[PDB]
Structure 1
């Protein structure tokens, strides 16, 4: 998974498009600094993320590790992120939204099956290709411990609000997924009427959630019930992603596909 700057013919911070000599078009995020000693650790972390190989999970394709040049290289994603897609003038039909949801469940079930907690799932981290299929990404480097060399709380489980030393769990991601479901059908971010972030945090910790009545589109009653289950205050009362899939897939095929 080691790449060289010379492997490239041509060209959340500063990124660029990269034309690889033999492996196609890519996206590069680069850190320019005085050199490391360290590099072996960054590489073991990159080979770990590169082991995450699933159709609904962004592929880290390589890294550049050169004296003073440290770069992550991931696959190209044509259509931006889910919020960009949801705000687009051409509205996204119910069948496509339902398939988007199913693909998010598939990617998250893969990640959890691999022992990986995302910890920052949100629409900005759900990237979309040309046919509206999605891939889950970690553009904030919340899982790239070493490489992380360098509005945001609406999807965060309340057990992490004002509690930064508590350890995230799979149920942390299930809460984020609940609010993503709301955004998918509201076509916007939640809590547009909140007073200030400090008050909002305390409100969410005490049980406030996105306003379901601000969903104006038709939203199947199953998805409404699913989002409320996945954002229960008690983490234990939220389902697992395999549990969600096993109910949601029959519903998707029977009713949405």
Structure 2
């Protein structure tokens, strides 16, 4: 029903390198230029952008517009001042448990909305969770995982990746189709990183050792969390990173249990 704002490069002053760009009348926006080079896709690209523009939720980043010009293709989206979740977590100012709990609930809210719309994120990770100045979050798709046409354009010939959060069924198996349960596993490791204030598996020596470990049941070190972590969140963590994908809960199921716990205890 709603339409995509078709933007031009002229209404942007300059973009400083994913890049921050100032719109002459609308201010700061994040611009992801996808293609630069030598037209048949301009239709499937804008139709995909119209399909993605429908997703509107307070915890999902808004696609503000698209730039479709000759040999120039970009996506324009909201600007979040504080960066991604890992950048905020590694800052020296400690984030209280009330804010961390609020962030978790908002991640659950945004994930349940995307799944309810049939969208599987496939790349949920702290780099894809952007934070504003009020410590509110919004889920992004900076890798263009769900943008099928725009990712095809990104990987085209004439156009001039962590594993910590991938479900084990996708490690060493590119032919496995990601499901909603794959996003639930990613959420589990994001939960751990929120309380550990860092990335997991710091003591890993080699990528092949890490892959074999996770596939055999190895998980982020819970004892490595020095911060206080509620018993219920550790239980939610271990439930969401179960080896069997059918044992992992759904985000509406996570939402039903976590919201009363957050309101009453956090």
Task: Give unmatched runs, 5+ long, in structure 2.
Answer: 152-159
Say if 2:59 is the partner of 1:49.
Answer: no
Verify the 8 A CA contact 1:14 1:29 in the aligned structure 2: no
* Cα separation, 2, equivalents of 1:245 and 1:23: 35
Q: CA deviation at 1:32?
A: 4.6
Match of 1:111 in 2: 114
**How far off its partner does 1:14 sit?**
4.8
**Structure 1, residues 34-53: CA drift from partner, whole Å, max 9, x if none?**
33331111111111111111
Task: Give per-residue Cα distances to partners, 1:131-155, cap 9 Å, x unaligned.
Answer: 000000011111112212x770000
What is the CA–CA distance in structure 2 between the aligned matches of 1:195 and 1:107, rounded to whole Å?
34
- The 2-side partners of 1:18 and 1:8 are apart by 7
Provide structure 1 residue ranges, at least 5 long, that are not aligned to the other structure: none
Distance 1:61 1:155 in 2: 28
**TM-score, structure 2 normalization:** 0.92
97-106 or 195-204: bigger deviation:
195-204
CA RMSD of aligned residues (A): 1.5
Retained in 2: the 8 A contact 1:155–1:180?
Answer: yes
Runs of 4+ that moved beyond 4 A: none
Q: Secondary structure at the match of 2:148?
A: coil
Q: 1:105 to 1:31 in 2, by over 3 A?
A: closer
Q: Is the 8 A contact 1:30 1:70 kept in 2?
A: yes
- 8 A contact 2:131–2:137 mirrored in 1: yes
Compute the displacement of 1:97 (Å).
Answer: 0.3
Given that 1:14 and 1:30 are in contact with CA atoms closer than 8 Å, whether structure 2 keeps it comes out as: no
Task: Please say if residues 80 and 128 of structure 1, whose CA atoms lie closer than 8 Å, have aligned partners that are also in contact.
Answer: yes
Provide TM-score, normalisation by structure 1: 0.95
Alpha-carbon distance in structure 2 between the residues aligned to 1:223 and 1:15: 33
Count of aligned residue pairs for this structure pair: 254
**SS at the partner of 1:223?**
helix
For 1:169 and 1:235, how far apart are their aligned partners in 2? 9
Give per-residue Cα distances to partners, 1:186-227, cap 9 Å, x unaligned.
001001111211111011011000010000100000000000
Alpha-carbon contact 2:34-2:150 (below 8 Å) kept: no
8 Å CA contact retained: 2:35, 2:72: yes
Q: Quick check: 2:82–2:131 contact (8 Å CA) kept in 1? A: yes
Matched, 1:7 2:7: no
